[PDB]
């Protein structure tokens, strides 16, 4: 569905919000594009917030 992501590492901050239809879809589909920008990091998304944080 509509989830937002925020990448946090040591010297790079990138966050994007895109329509993913579902959860794991946002987990698999979004993670690719979200990583497509800042793959270097790995995200940890919450359900309470509905946001993933790609941290490297």
């Amino acid at each position: 569905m509509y989830y937002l992501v925020v990448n946090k590492g040591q010297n790079a901050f990138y966050e994007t919000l895109t329509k993913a239809v579902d959860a794991e879809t946002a987990r698999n589909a979004f993670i690719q594009s979200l990583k497509d920008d800042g793959v270097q990091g790995v995200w940890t998304y919450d359900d309470a917030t509905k946001t993933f944080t790609v941290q490297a």
Side-chain angles (χ1 to χ4, degrees), residues 11-52:
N11 204 237
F13 43 89
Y14 150 91
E15 124 193 17
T16 29
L17 46 106
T18 209
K19 282 44 185 161
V21 189
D22 225 32
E24 318 105 303
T25 310
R27 193 76 163 196
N28 217 249
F30 206 6
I31 195 136
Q32 316 242 341
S33 277
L34 135 289
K35 280 222 234 287
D36 196 73
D37 260 86
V39 36
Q40 327 308 325
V42 65
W43 76 25
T44 20
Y45 141 113
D46 229 27
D47 238 339
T49 80
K50 317 127 105 190
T51 16
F52 354 59

